[PDB]
Amino acid sequence: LLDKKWLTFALAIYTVFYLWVRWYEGVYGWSAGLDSFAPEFETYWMNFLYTEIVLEIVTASILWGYLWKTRDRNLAALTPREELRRNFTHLVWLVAYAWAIYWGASYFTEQDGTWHQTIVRDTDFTPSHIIEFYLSYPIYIITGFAAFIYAKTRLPFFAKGISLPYLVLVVGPFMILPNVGLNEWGHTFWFMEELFVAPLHYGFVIFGWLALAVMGTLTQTFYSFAQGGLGQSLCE
Amino acid sequence: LLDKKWLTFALAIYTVFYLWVRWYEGVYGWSAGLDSFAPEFETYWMNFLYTEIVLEIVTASILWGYLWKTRDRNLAALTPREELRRNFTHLVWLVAYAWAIYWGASYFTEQDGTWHQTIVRDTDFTPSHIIEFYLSYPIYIITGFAAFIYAKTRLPFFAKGISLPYLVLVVGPFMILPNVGLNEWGHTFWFMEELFVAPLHYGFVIFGWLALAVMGTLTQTFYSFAQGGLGQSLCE
Amino acid sequence: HGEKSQAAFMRMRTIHWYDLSWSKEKVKINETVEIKGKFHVFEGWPETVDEPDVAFLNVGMPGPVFIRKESYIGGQLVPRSVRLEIGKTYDFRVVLKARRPGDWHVHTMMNVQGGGPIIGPGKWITVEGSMSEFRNPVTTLTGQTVDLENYNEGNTYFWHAFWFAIGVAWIGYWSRRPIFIPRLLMVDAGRADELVSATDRKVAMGFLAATILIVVMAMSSANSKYPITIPLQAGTMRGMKPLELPAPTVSVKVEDATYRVPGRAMRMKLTITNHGNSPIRLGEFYTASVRFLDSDVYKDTTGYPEDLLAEDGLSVSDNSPLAPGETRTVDVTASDAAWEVYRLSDIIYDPDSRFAGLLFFFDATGNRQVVQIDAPLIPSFM
Amino acid sequence: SWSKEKVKINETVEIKGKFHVFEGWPETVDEPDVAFLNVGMPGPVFIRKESY
Amino acid sequence: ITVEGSMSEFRNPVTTLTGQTVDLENYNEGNTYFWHAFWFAIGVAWIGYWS
Amino acid sequence: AVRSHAEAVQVSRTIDWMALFVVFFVIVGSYHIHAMLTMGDWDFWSDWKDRRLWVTVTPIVLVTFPAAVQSYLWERYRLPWGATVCVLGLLLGEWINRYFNFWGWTYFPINFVFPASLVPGAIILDTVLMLSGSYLFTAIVGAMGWGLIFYPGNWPIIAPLHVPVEYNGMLMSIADIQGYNYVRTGTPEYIRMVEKGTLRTFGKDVAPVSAFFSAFMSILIYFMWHFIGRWFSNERFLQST
Amino acid sequence: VPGAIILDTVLMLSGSYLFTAIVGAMGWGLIFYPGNWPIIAPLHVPVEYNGMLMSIADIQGYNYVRTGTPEYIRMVEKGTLRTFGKDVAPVSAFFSAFMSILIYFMWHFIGRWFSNERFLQST
Numbered sequence A, B: 001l002l003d004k005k006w007l008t009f010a011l012a013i014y015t016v017f018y019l020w021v022r023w024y025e026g027v028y029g030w031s032a033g034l035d036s037f038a039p040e041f042e043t044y045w046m047n048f049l050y051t052e053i054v055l056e057i058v059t060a061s062i063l064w065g066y067l068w069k070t071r072d073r074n075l076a077a078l079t080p081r082e083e084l085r086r087n088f089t090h091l092v093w094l095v096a097y098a099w100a101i102y103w104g105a106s107y108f109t110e111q112d113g114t115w116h117q118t119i120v121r122d123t124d125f126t127p128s129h130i131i132e133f134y135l136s137y138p139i140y141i142i143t144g145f146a147a148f149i150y151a152k153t154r155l156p157f158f159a160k161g162i163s164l165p166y167l168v169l170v171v172g173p174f175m176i177l178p179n180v181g182l183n184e185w186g187h188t189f190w191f192m193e194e195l196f197v198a199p200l201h202y203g204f205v206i207f208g209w210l211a212l213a214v215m216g217t218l219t220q221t222f223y224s225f226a227q228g229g230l231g232q233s234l235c236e
Numbered sequence C: 001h002g003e004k005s006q007a008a009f010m011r012m013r014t015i016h017w018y019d020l021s022w023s024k025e026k027v028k029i030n031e032t033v034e035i036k037g038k039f040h041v042f043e044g045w046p047e048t049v050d051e052p053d054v055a056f057l058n059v060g061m062p063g064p065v066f067i068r069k070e071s072y073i074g075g076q077l078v079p080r081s082v083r084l085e086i087g088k089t090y091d092f093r094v095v096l097k098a099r100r101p102g103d104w105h106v107h108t109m110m111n112v113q114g115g116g117p118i119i120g121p122g123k124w125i126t127v128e129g130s131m132s133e134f135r136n137p138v139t140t141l142t143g144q145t146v147d148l149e150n151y152n153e154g155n156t157y158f159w160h161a162f163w164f165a166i167g168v169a170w171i172g173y174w175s176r177r178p179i180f181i182p183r184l185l186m187v188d189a190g191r192a193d194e195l196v197s198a199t200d201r202k203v204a205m206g207f208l209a210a211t212i213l214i215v216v217m218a219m220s221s222a223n224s225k226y227p228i229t230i231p232l233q234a235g236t237m238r239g240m241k242p243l244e245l246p247a248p249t250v251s252v253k254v255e256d257a258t259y260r261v262p263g264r265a266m267r268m269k270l271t272i273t274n275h276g277n278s279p280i281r282l283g284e285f286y287t288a289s290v291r292f293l294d295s296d297v298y299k300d301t302t303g304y305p306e307d308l309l310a311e312d313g314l315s316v317s318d319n320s321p322l323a324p325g326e327t328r329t330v331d332v333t334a335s336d337a338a339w340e341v342y343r344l345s346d347i348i349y350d351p352d353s354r355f356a357g358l359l360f361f362f363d364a365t366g367n368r369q370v371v372q373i374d375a376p377l378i379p380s381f382m
Numbered sequence D: 001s002w003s004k005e006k007v008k009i010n011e012t013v014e015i016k017g018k019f020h021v022f023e024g025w026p027e028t029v030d031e032p033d034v035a036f037l038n039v040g041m042p043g044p045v046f047i048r049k050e051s052y
Numbered sequence E: 001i002t003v004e005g006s007m008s009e010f011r012n013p014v015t016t017l018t019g020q021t022v023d024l025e026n027y028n029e030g031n032t033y034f035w036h037a038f039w040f041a042i043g044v045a046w047i048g049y050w051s
Numbered sequence F: 001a002v003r004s005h006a007e008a009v010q011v012s013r014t015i016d017w018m019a020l021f022v023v024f025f026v027i028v029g030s031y032h033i034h035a036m037l038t039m040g041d042w043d044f045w046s047d048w049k050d051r052r053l054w055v056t057v058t059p060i061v062l063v064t065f066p067a068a069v070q071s072y073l074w075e076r077y078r079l080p081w082g083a084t085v086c087v088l089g090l091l092l093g094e095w096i097n098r099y100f101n102f103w104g105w106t107y108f109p110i111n112f113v114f115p116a117s118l119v120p121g122a123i124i125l126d127t128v129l130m131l132s133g134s135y136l137f138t139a140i141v142g143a144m145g146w147g148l149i150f151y152p153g154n155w156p157i158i159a160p161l162h163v164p165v166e167y168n169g170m171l172m173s174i175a176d177i178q179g180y181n182y183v184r185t186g187t188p189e190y191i192r193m194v195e196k197g198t199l200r201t202f203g204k205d206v207a208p209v210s211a212f213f214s215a216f217m218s219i220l221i222y223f224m225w226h227f228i229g230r231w232f233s234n235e236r237f238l239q240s241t
Numbered sequence G: 001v002p003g004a005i006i007l008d009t010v011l012m013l014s015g016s017y018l019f020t021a022i023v024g025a026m027g028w029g030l031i032f033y034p035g036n037w038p039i040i041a042p043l044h045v046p047v048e049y050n051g052m053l054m055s056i057a058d059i060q061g062y063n064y065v066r067t068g069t070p071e072y073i074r075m076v077e078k079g080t081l082r083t084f085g086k087d088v089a090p091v092s093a094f095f096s097a098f099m100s101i102l103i104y105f106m107w108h109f110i111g112r113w114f115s116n117e118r119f120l121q122s123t
């Protein structure tokens, strides 16, 4: 079996959900979504914010708890074929994390830029941010934490210790979410402008760099892949 | 034989050439050399720039290629007396590099300061810079690269590896030449002044510090000198 | 000599120098040449140039071929930086004493604290004689006359040579013994603790004590002699008196201004309304150190530099006298080789294609009106 | 002008006058674009009731 | 302010000093697309050759 | 290798002289770059040699190279003249430029373009380092002395230039008149970063306060550049660049 | 892409990272503006727009309203009194190439750190 069709679902769920989110914001961007004090904004975007925050907290709790509860206690007696299967599953998790990171840190963040050059900022909870800071960022945070937990609880290579590159790759991008406090503070007190390259935004830049720990993470996963099922073929 | 009269030539060539350059700029500083758009400036300083750049490229290519082609393949079977002779030759190369570094980084650079306090800057190719940025800096870069190549290709101590202090001493001062881009950018966009201590000039300062790697380089050459011909006398 | 490189629009709209005059064209060593005139600060000061809140009236020359004896902005001496107001007109005066023989292009310039040099017109002044004849006597408040060419030179040389000799003595004392390789080997192989022993420590103590004592005694001696000293006098001088020019009786509206690319001419259309009670005629257009004159109206007699003066460079389509109250629209062409020699045609390279200048209207009696114009400058290619 | 020279506790003393800002303001002192009318005293030996 | 019609009808003609009238809605669009696609294809060719 | 003890001594002496040349002139070039692009503007002009900025800045930025060269020379050879050789090389390069270019090329007077004196500070730094070989003691006491002795060391030179003069109705020192007379086309008066007075300048304290601030920051800069020179003295080899 | 290709080829050939940081980063900085010139050149055609000289790009920025992006926010070349001749683009390109050398040198080691494979016993 080895690599199964979970990869297709991992790609498709993010693609479909984010395409629907893009449709939703293209429909309710203007027309209940420009004025932050209109009653329709509260029903179409504040309710969206509340629902998504509750659902994100619940989903994170459920997913992380299930992954930690179903953790492999007897990792010592694990066959190499099953290790290869689990390595492929962890690679699927990493693919999902990469897709979520793309959607969160590129698509909706530069989309926040479109909005932060076309309309006058009205609040800290515009549609663009709600879709990005409080939906896509928590989604990729959940995916990254789930991937880290799965690696630690199923892969013997990633067990018996916390991987430093994996921890950086998982936590640094998370630090962008609390960095939103600097974004709002730096937009209301600092910089009475919409400059996208202002120093108020280097917080995302600093913690966007920490996603480069994916290189150390990926060489660690390559070594985990090539533990028993390394060969032969390769290097022979 | 050991130390031969190549040292006299190493000092004299730089002294005579730079004395002639100083005479040339004292003659053509004013009077075809103040106005950068006059036809006489093009014949007396732009032609100087073109000729010196071509000659520097040709001389660097010839010298480095000859030193690398005549490299010692059988460094293992080298007598200690010949090693002492080669160490003295490398010391002569270092003396020439020090003399060139003096002329480039002190004389003509503070001379650029005289000009950058006495006349209104007219271009990026004033006589002072042409004589300094594009003549003296390339000259000492060529000398430093030649000294490094000679050490690596003749001295067994400096073979079997690239010396870190030597590489820093050779490359850091070279980095001042591309740093000219910061000088011109920092004089036309930044700092509508002639302040010689402006931050636009800290690029030379930063890479002028890297010439302090001469200390590690020189203790390495001392160890190379004291390999077989260390004693006795010394430490006995 | 540092202009013809600055942006043409920056040269056009920073400061307009007019009524310039030079007392002498050829001077001997120690002789004085006086440069007078008026400069007007343009209202549309470019935004990347800081406002002349701190400005210095400088002289553009190849080093101290002259010494600036005096400089005035509004009648009062200005040895320090001054504050200038945008839109005001000031009269200046610079006095130079010849120091170095040769042919020198002397410019009157203004340096701004945040915009760099604003170079005015330059005039060739010949200096004859020998530099050895130059004297710069100064009388101090303590009652002694000194020559600034060589005052304190011997003392400076002595002190620097003395301290250099002290340092050389220290280094040579340590350099009498073997220096590099034996000492390196002694420090490496076991404890060194043999290369620094008495009386080396005694010599170091002597050097330190002698240095401190010599510094203290020299300071005390330099306090006894010259008992009266003042700090360096510095500080921007406010309250520069501007000229109280009468309000112009000529109103000019610029309706488009074009220049051919390539070309040596600039063409503009002006609607001139003549108020007051005298028929006026346009006689001069000054844009950036370049004076385009209509010879039928005005002739230059102040010895303006030939390369910057266009005696017949200004052509007006209808330069007949303009009766008071009458308003007419004319086509004005300013054409001279200076437009390309001083790179005023390089405004096409500038990120702000706008020009400013001065128009001078003369009546029959000869009295003139200074009216200031500025407009976008549109290149034409087809 | 000072209204009183000797006062009891809780009594009021009024200081009046005119101040002129010099035209030749020294360059190392910023122009009084933001200025505060203060009272020079050794701590709150008086309380500033009002200032105009 | 109410706007009626279709966005496809919008025109933004501009006449340059070189003597050509261009529509600012689509001027240079094809050239931009071509150059970006060409350089992207070059990079993709490099990566695929190594892949 | 070497023939005998005598020829070994002769070879070592020749190496000593050649390496001294190399060290001295590489230091001259690098230190002069650093000095002229960190404090050269004050070092160029007597009317720039003031009591606040010149006294504050020059020792702070000039203690850099002496600290590193001391940390190398004393540690590796017990040679207590790193600071002195740095200062002497800087002075030689400056003076050569002043005489042959400032006065040779252009014709600015020497009494107008003389450089500052730093040998007393260098001597303090070197002696305080050799005695009590502690680098920490040097960084605290010798750097203090280096910062403090700068202005008193230069006072015998610049004192005659501070004689007051009534110059066309305005009070000017001799140095101010020099700066006014000898025209620097590229250096207007406002560029002069000199003491201009504040409303918090109490009494006669500008020079001593600046000297003590310079001494403290000299302690800091010496401490940093000791380790900078320690790194620059490494003898590592790289297998691949 | 042209700068990226230069950086990659100059690195594979002469595998030296120092040589890459000096030469390939130089080329990366220098080829940026010439690489983009075929795209942005047609937008720099001069236009007489209501009496003022504007490039096509200036007219685009003027016409298509950016409510959050006023004109003064535009950090573009505005001219100085020390801008000599026609040198704005080349001087900027060379400054960018030098600072690209510096930034490449720093980020080579930044990536070296990010490539580590260490394990932590306790967070």
Ligand SMILES: CCCCCCCCCCCC(=O)OC[C@H](COP(=O)(O)OCC[N+](C)(C)C)OC(=O)CCCCCCCCCCC
Binding pocket: A013, A016, A017, A020, A021, A024, A043, A044, A047, A048, A049, A051, A052, A053, A055, A056, A059, A060, A138, A139, A142
């Ligand atoms: C990592 C864990 C993430 C947790 C957060 C998830 C956020 C989900 C969206 C919040 C919606 C909200 O809050 O709004 C509720 C909206 C408000 O629209 P309405 O006024 O009812 O109009 C009619 C509804 N339309 C406008 C959408 C047509 O209506 C709803 O009930 C519909 C919400 C559907 C969400 C599920 C579909 C997602 C795409 C399919 C692939 C997964």
Ligand SMILES: CCCCCCCCCCCC(=O)OC[C@H](COP(=O)(O)OCC[N+](C)(C)C)OC(=O)CCCCCCCCCCC
Binding pocket: B013, B016, B017, B020, B021, B024, B043, B044, B047, B048, B049, B051, B052, B053, B055, B056, B059, B060, B138, B139, B142
């Ligand atoms: C590391 C490798 C360095 C490579 C660069 C070397 C640059 C050389 C100078 C460029 C000259 C130029 O370009 O100008 C060419 C000049 C222009 O002067 P002219 O108008 O002919 O007047 C008459 C010539 N006088 C004014 C010099 C008298 O004339 C020449 O033909 C003469 C150039 C002589 C250069 C060789 C002598 C150097 C000193 C002796 C010790 C070496």
Ligand SMILES: CCCCCCCCCCCC(=O)OC[C@H](COP(=O)(O)OCC[N+](C)(C)C)OC(=O)CCCCCCCCCCC
Binding pocket: B053, B056, B134, B135, B138, G086, G087, G090, G091
């Ligand atoms: C390691 C260093 C090696 C140096 C190799 C130099 C090769 C030059 C190739 C031709 C480029 C060209 O012709 O183009 C340069 C363009 C000219 O721009 P323009 O005049 O504004 O307009 C375009 C006009 N055309 C269409 C006619 C070109 O940009 C510049 O202004 C940069 C020129 C300054 C370069 C300074 C380099 C200093 C090197 C010092 C070596 C000791």
Ligand SMILES: CCCCCCCCCCCC(=O)OC[C@H](COP(=O)(O)OCC[N+](C)(C)C)OC(=O)CCCCCCCCCCC
Binding pocket: F202, F203, F204, F205, F208, F209, F212
């Ligand atoms: C031998 C043991 C006893 C002496 C010990 C020293 C005590 C002070 C002597 C003052 C002499 C003088 O001249 O005063 C000081 C003169 C001013 O003098 P003034 O104008 O009269 O000020 C009138 C007001 N007063 C009467 C209060 C002075 O400059 C200064 O403000 C210098 C200030 C330096 C501040 C930084 C010091 C950092 C120290 C770091 C330690 C590690």
Ligand SMILES: CCCCCCCCCCCC(=O)OC[C@H](COP(=O)(O)OCC[N+](C)(C)C)OC(=O)CCCCCCCCCCC
Binding pocket: C212, C215, C216, C219, C223, C229, F051, F124, F144, F145, F148, F149, F151, F152, F204, F205, F206, F207, F208, F209, F211
């Ligand atoms: C090992 C360390 C050796 C240090 C040697 C110091 C020599 C003494 C110089 C006398 C200073 C002076 O006389 O007064 C201060 C004058 C400033 O005067 P001015 O504002 O220019 O006034 C002009 C009129 N004059 C000419 C009369 C001055 O000089 C200075 O600002 C330097 C102040 C540094 C002195 C600090 C010494 C305190 C002891 C150190 C404790 C840890």
Ligand SMILES: CCCCCCCCCCCC(=O)OC[C@H](COP(=O)(O)OCC[N+](C)(C)C)OC(=O)CCCCCCCCCCC
Binding pocket: F204, F205, F208
């Ligand atoms: C580790 C710290 C040890 C301290 C040792 C101090 C020895 C002082 C020697 C005499 C110097 C002198 O007399 O000169 C000091 C000069 C005075 O300058 P002046 O008044 O402007 O003019 C010159 C007037 N003369 C010619 C009469 C001198 O400079 C100063 O203002 C500096 C004074 C402040 C010093 C603060 C030190 C605080 C130490 C704290 C210890 C707990």
Ligand SMILES: CCCCCCCCCCCC(=O)OC[C@H](COP(=O)(O)OCC[N+](C)(C)C)OC(=O)CCCCCCCCCCC
Binding pocket: B036, B046, B049, B050, B053, B054, B123, B124, B125, B126, B177, B178, B179, B180, B181, B184, G084, G085, G086, G087, G090, G091, G094
């Ligand atoms: C093949 C070997 C011979 C050629 C070698 C190159 C010599 C220079 C060619 C200039 C061509 C040109 O176009 O000039 C340069 C054009 C301006 O031209 P202008 O408006 O006519 O200026 C009129 C005034 N002049 C006659 C004096 C030029 O832009 C520039 O200022 C570019 C300046 C770049 C500064 C940063 C350079 C950093 C180099 C780093 C090296 C590691």
Ligand SMILES: CCCCCCCCCCCC(=O)OC[C@H](COP(=O)(O)OCC[N+](C)(C)C)OC(=O)CCCCCCCCCCC
Binding pocket: G006, G026, G027, G030, G031, G033, G034, G086, G087, G088, G089, G090, G091, G093
């Ligand atoms: C491996 C490295 C490869 C580098 C390839 C460089 C391609 C040459 C581009 C010609 C430049 C030009 O034509 O002139 C300069 C123009 C600027 O012109 P503008 O001010 O926009 O004028 C507008 C009018 N136009 C359209 C006519 C320009 O472009 C630049 O500013 C980029 C300057 C970088 C050139 C540096 C090359 C020097 C050799 C490098 C030595 C170490």
Ligand SMILES: CCCCCCCCCC(=O)OC[C@H](COP(=O)(O)OCC[N+](C)(C)C)OC(=O)CCCCCCCCC
Binding pocket: B164, B167, B168, B169, B171, B172, F236, F237, F238, F239, F240, F241, G017, G018
């Ligand atoms: C201004 C601040 C100082 C700049 C220099 C920082 C030096 C930091 C150390 C460093 O770069 O590491 C060296 C390696 C390349 O050498 P290596 O191949 O690691 O050498 C192998 C042998 N060794 C383990 C004993 C070292 O590094 C590399 O991976 C390649 C880059 C080499 C840079 C050093 C040379 C700089 C010359 C100017």
Ligand SMILES: CCCCCCCCCC(=O)OC[C@H](COP(=O)(O)OCC[N+](C)(C)C)OC(=O)CCCCCCCCC
Binding pocket: F128, F131, F132, F133, F134, F137
């Ligand atoms: C607690 C801090 C107070 C200040 C003390 C800091 C000095 C510490 C320096 C150190 O670590 O020791 C190095 C030398 C060791 O030499 P010794 O062989 O101990 O010499 C002792 C005889 N002696 C008093 C003449 C020195 O000893 C010395 O450094 C010299 C000791 C004499 C003190 C005065 C020297 C400094 C002169 C300015």
Ligand SMILES: CCCCCCCCCC(=O)OC[C@H](COP(=O)(O)OCC[N+](C)(C)C)OC(=O)CCCCCCCCC
Binding pocket: B064, B145, F241, G010, G013, G014, G015, G016, G019
């Ligand atoms: C003193 C500084 C002058 C510049 C030299 C810096 C280059 C040093 C790079 C280095 O450390 O060596 C790596 C390779 C080693 O390959 P080799 O097996 O030595 O190949 C030699 C044959 N060759 C000439 C075709 C290369 O050799 C190369 O890197 C390529 C050598 C050919 C030079 C041109 C390559 C760069 C193209 C832009």
Ligand SMILES: CCCCCCCCCC(=O)OC[C@H](COP(=O)(O)OCC[N+](C)(C)C)OC(=O)CCCCCCCCC
Binding pocket: A164, A167, A168, A169, A171, A172, G118, G119, G120, G121, G122, G123
């Ligand atoms: C943006 C700049 C980079 C940020 C990261 C800096 C990393 C510096 C190294 C570091 O923090 O040391 C790790 C220790 C905790 O692990 P340890 O318990 O020391 O691991 C024991 C095994 N080991 C000796 C082989 C490492 O450290 C601790 O004491 C706890 C803090 C752990 C921080 C690293 C994880 C960061 C995830 C984003």
Ligand SMILES: CCCCCC(=O)OC[C@H](COP(=O)(O)OCC[N+](C)(C)C)OC(=O)CCCCC
Binding pocket: A019, A022, A023, A024, A026, A027
């Ligand atoms: C790799 C990221 C793909 C992002 C594509 C995207 O944002 O799609 C939305 C956009 C919306 O424009 P349009 O297709 O015209 O449909 C408009 C519907 N709304 C306004 C809700 C977005 O176009 C599509 O839906 C195309 C489908 C691409 C599938 C990968």
Ligand SMILES: CCCCCC(=O)OC[C@H](COP(=O)(O)OCC[N+](C)(C)C)OC(=O)CCCCC
Binding pocket: A190, A191, A192, A193, A199
């Ligand atoms: C890594 C480079 C950081 C440079 C910081 C910067 O560009 O700040 C510009 C800003 C200058 O403000 P400005 O750009 O004029 O802002 C105009 C808009 N307002 C007045 C509303 C802020 O300066 C500061 O306020 C200090 C920044 C501290 C950085 C740690």
Ligand SMILES: CCCCCC(=O)OC[C@H](COP(=O)(O)OCC[N+](C)(C)C)OC(=O)CCCCC
Binding pocket: B019, B022, B023, B024, B026, B027, F096, F100, F104
């Ligand atoms: C250690 C650096 C020596 C620099 C000396 C220098 O720049 O010399 C030029 C200067 C020029 O002044 P001068 O001698 O009067 O001759 C003028 C000739 N020009 C104007 C061409 C320099 O003086 C000399 O030529 C003296 C020779 C010293 C030999 C080490």
Ligand SMILES: CCCCCC(=O)OC[C@H](COP(=O)(O)OCC[N+](C)(C)C)OC(=O)CCCCC
Binding pocket: B190, B191, B192, B193, B199, C113, C114, C115
């Ligand atoms: C290591 C110390 C660096 C301190 C930088 C500095 O002194 O900058 C002064 C300058 C203040 O400009 P100013 O001195 O007023 O310049 C006057 C002349 N103009 C207006 C033409 C630039 O500030 C900046 O523009 C930011 C510098 C960033 C350094 C990384």
